[PDB]
Amino acid sequence: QAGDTLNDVIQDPTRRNKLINDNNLLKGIIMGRDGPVPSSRELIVRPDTLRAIINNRATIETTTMEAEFTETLMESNYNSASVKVSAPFITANSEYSESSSFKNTETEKSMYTSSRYLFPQGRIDFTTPDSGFDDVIKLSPQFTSGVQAALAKATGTEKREALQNLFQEYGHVFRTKVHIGGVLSAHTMETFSRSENETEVKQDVKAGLEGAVKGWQGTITTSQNRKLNVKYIVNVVQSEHWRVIEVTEVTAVADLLPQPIRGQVKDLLKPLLGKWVDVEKVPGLESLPVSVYRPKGAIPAGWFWLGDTADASKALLVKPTLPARSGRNPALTSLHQGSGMTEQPFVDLPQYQYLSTYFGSFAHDTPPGSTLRGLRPDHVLPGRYEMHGDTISTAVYVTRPVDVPFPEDECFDLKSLVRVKLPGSGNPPKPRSALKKSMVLFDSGE
């Protein structure tokens, strides 16, 4: 047995099957409220062999992440690409709450750090259908039949509910490249002012955490006298004890389906249905440098708007696709009047955000206030401000999307209006967010 490698394990059918079963290589990851836990239902068909490479270099690696809800992924040792792919699901299914230790304000920045002391044995890879090679993985007939049954339902709401249940059961992503071996992991989070040198905070934290993982103390003091709380994970103990130590690539489970069904599933999974409507100029507010526009007429029943905009052409209405249910984050939230000395609204739910400040008096019991809603944190991305006006008392910001080369991250250009100086005191934090284009479905007959 001594000197045995992943090659020998794969060559022996019994040992190969034991490795597959013990590492859950045929199952997707559910990315739920408890984190990336593998499902208990097989997603793909058992392969007759595995693609593997041998690697035995033991060393300490360190990774850093800036996303908010990626703590569990970092604890599971997902590289940057895998964390980026999995972030939407983790955010959507997370448990939001105030008093979150993570801070991402315009003045301070928070980051997660993870150090892995690895004893690798190799890497196992799977062929996705998009690759185009002859050894693609084949989805299980049970999963395919479940998808067909979900898409064969009478109504769009029923189809979406069936798809949600199916994905909650079978997982949201599939690990396509996984490293085998043992690993001792140490994870921490650090918040620091944006003015501080980021390439020195990162270096100090990395040095401290690397020293901590080499020795193996729940608390660490770095060179800069920074106090860090460290969480330790042990995944080391013979080929029978080899376990997955790192995920180098994941592919969304939806992407594994044939194209005609994949398109329908992706469209049906969009949280919001969108619509374009005419706009009307808000009476008054002649002091402000730019005009304020709100949706004209009565909002159609069941639809909501997102806030005041400087665009004089059209306004975007959105409608939830999934009915509100316990244990599921709503796509939108109601807003409530502020506590005192402010007419601005506040998000009912912990970590939701609206795009524009209210230009007037907000009353949630009467229109158009009763139809104003916030957004789930995964629906929005940070934008940029364009300033108008000559004085603080009347200045406004128009929120424009941050141009990106990849269409996947494009955001709607709603030109949300933000008052520079809100009269009174105790106002809500200024919104600087833009809606994601991928979260809205247009032209549907729904």
Binding site: E106, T107, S195, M387, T391, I392, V420, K421, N427, K430
Partner: protein
């Protein structure tokens, strides 16, 4: 003398921090709000960060019955730009001369500062609200 006094309300209307520096009362004394007797040290405000939407009060006035007025200086600086100077404020409410003086100097262009409420004819300098914002 207490009849000569000044209050400065720094209000960071912007969204990024602004730091006080070089606060120095050449004449008179600083004190806590509402109590000219409760003298306070410049260290109580030196180097302080005014977070966005926060208000910071500086109260100065003449000493106990002395013929002195009050006079002082400080600087608003940007903590996020290597403490680059935003503005320099000079205040003077003399006991002898009737005319007061409130001067704001500097040339930082990525900042907007607006001060209002000063009195320059006679009597105390008054209350001055200084709204600060970073473009």
């Amino acid at each position: 003398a207490y009849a000569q006094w000044v209050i400065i309300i720094i209000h960071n209307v912007g969204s990024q921090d602004v730091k006080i520096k070089n606060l120095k009362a050449s004449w008179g004394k600083l004190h806590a709000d509402g109590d000219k007797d409760a003298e306070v040290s410049a260290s109580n405000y030196e180097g302080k960060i005014v977070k966005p939407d926060e208000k910071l009060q500086i109260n100065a006035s003449g000493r106990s019955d002395a013929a002195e007025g009050t006079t002082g200086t400080f600087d608003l600086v940007d903590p996020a730009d290597g403490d680059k100077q935003v503005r320099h404020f000079y205040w003077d409410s003399p006991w002898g001369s009737k005319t007061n003086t409130w001067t704001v100097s500097g040339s930082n262009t990525k900042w907007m500062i607006e001060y209002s409420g000063q009195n320059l004819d006679s009597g105390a300098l008054g209350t001055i609200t200084v709204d600060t914002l970073k473009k």
